[PDB]
Design a protein that fits this description.
By secondary structure, this protein is an all-alpha fold. The chain contains 24 helices and no strands. It is classed as ligase.
């Protein structure tokens, strides 16, 4: 109705797959001749050109070119297979995310950077790329960004093949995880009477499962072992009664993270001390409300405290994200300056992460309005601020796209996943 505009080549293509494959294997078993390396390199170039064909993706995925892509991912082969992934990805995202996440399955700063580079380059589709009006899109740390990317990749991995109830439950849990971790990382933690959306005889249009799904998700968040007896007690679309739900929440509260559990709507409707102050993220946000600070002696002593804590042998579970941007924006005391100096010097001392965050935040710039190692670690390399910010904007565009796509599919099918209300509300605010 709307748009009426819209083989032997494939068999020869399969022959080409076999031949180029055996040649790649020969290049691998003869990984001593840069000549043969380069030959098969341009070969895979021609391959990528061919696999750029739309319907050929069938023959591609059937031949298993991912095995070669993995055995390949030399700088020549590196840049080659990178371009290769880009070409193979533009049209088809599934096997893209798949081979990527499985190569991931096969974490130093080097590994993290290699991975994020492969992502940020190889998978830049129209879905991931769009505009942004420069709202205060905050920073993040490396490990958190990496976890967000892995979740996004799993989502897109399963987001096309959709018993069928099993696939539905899997996809629901997947998107729930992605939105959960995204809200966390990016740090975003009576109704009016029924009026018709259309009116500016009685109107035949003007006149729970989601709760159970969310409960089941939280249950699956428990250990599989300790859930095996919980599984038996249960014995996944069995409706519940409020009493059974209260029992469930009570028995789950005993195992163990749960700051979001406590802040959830499901409960609304239904050393070791350091461990306590940590696990209770209410004490985390309380650390934030304390740092919210004339507070000369208090702030000075607390900075000394968190500093002696900054060489703690463990317990980096601390947020370590807001621990920078407030002071970085704040700065007239000589003690103020020296405190900021100790602050940075400790910050870039254990994990380069938040130091890199400062770098992206403009650290080596403020190291000019100034004392030495600050800038030394600040402009150690700015070859990553662009990449980190790129990964942030990309992941956000991708998740907003998944949201829109779900709204459209449910329009088509005439029929609620976890946390979707949270995301929709906080995006509409």
């Amino acid at each position: 109705a709307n748009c009426p505009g819209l083989e032997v080549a494939m068999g020869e293509m399969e022959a080409d797959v076999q031949a180029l494959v055996r040649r790649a294997a020969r290049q691998l078993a003869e990984s001593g001749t840069p000549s043969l390396t380069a030959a098969v390199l341009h070969t895979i170039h021609v391959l990528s050109a061919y696999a750029s064909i739309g319907p050929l993706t069938g023959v591609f995925r059937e031949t298993g070119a991912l095995d070669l892509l993995m055995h390949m991912l030399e700088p020549q082969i590196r840049r080659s297979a990178g371009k290769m992934l880009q070409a193979l990805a533009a049209h088809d995202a599934g096997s893209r995310a798949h081979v990527l996440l499985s190569l991931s399955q096969q974490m130093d700063f080097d590994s993290r950077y290699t991975l994020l580079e492969l992502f940020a380059e190889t998978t830049s589709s129209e879905e991931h790329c769009m505009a942004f009006e420069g709202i205060h899109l905050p920073q993040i740390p490396g490990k958190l960004l990496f976890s967000l990317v892995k979740r996004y990749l799993c989502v897109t991995s399963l987001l096309d093949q959709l018993s069928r109830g099993q696939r539905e439950l899997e996809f629901s849990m997947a998107v729930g995880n992605l939105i959960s971790e995204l809200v966390r990382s990016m740090g975003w933690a009576p109704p009016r009477p029924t009026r018709s959306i259309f009116q500016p005889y009685p109107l035949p249009y003007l006149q729970t499962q989601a709760e159970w799904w969310e409960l089941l998700f939280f249950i699956k968040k428990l250990d599989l072992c300790e859930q095996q007896p919980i599984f038996q007690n249960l014995w996944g679309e069995i409706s519940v009664s409020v009493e059974m739900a209260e029992s469930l929440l009570q028995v789950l509260s005993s195992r163990f993270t749960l700051n979001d559990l406590l802040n959830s709507q499901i409960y609304t409707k239904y050393r070791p001390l350091l461990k306590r102050l940590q696990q209770e993220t209410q004490p985390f946000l309380l650390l934030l409300r304390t740092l919210d600070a004339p507070n000369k002696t208090l702030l000075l002593s607390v900075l000394r405290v968190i500093t002696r804590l900054l060489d703690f042998p463990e317990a980096m579970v601390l947020p370590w994200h807001e621990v920078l941007e407030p002071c970085l924006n704040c700065l007239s005391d000589s003690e103020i300056v020296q405190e900021l100096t100790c602050f940075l010097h400790r910050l870039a001392s254990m994990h380069k992460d938040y130091a890199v965050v400062l770098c992206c935040l403009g650290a080596k710039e403020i190291l000019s309005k100034v004392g030495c190692e600050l800038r030394d670690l600040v402009t150690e390399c700015e070859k990553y601020a662009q990449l980190y910010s790129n990964l942030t904007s990309s992941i956000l565009a991708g998740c907003i796209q998944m949201v829109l796509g779900q709204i459209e599919d449910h329009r088509r099918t005439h029929q609620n996943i976890p946390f979707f209300d949270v995301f929709l509300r906080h995006l509409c605010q």
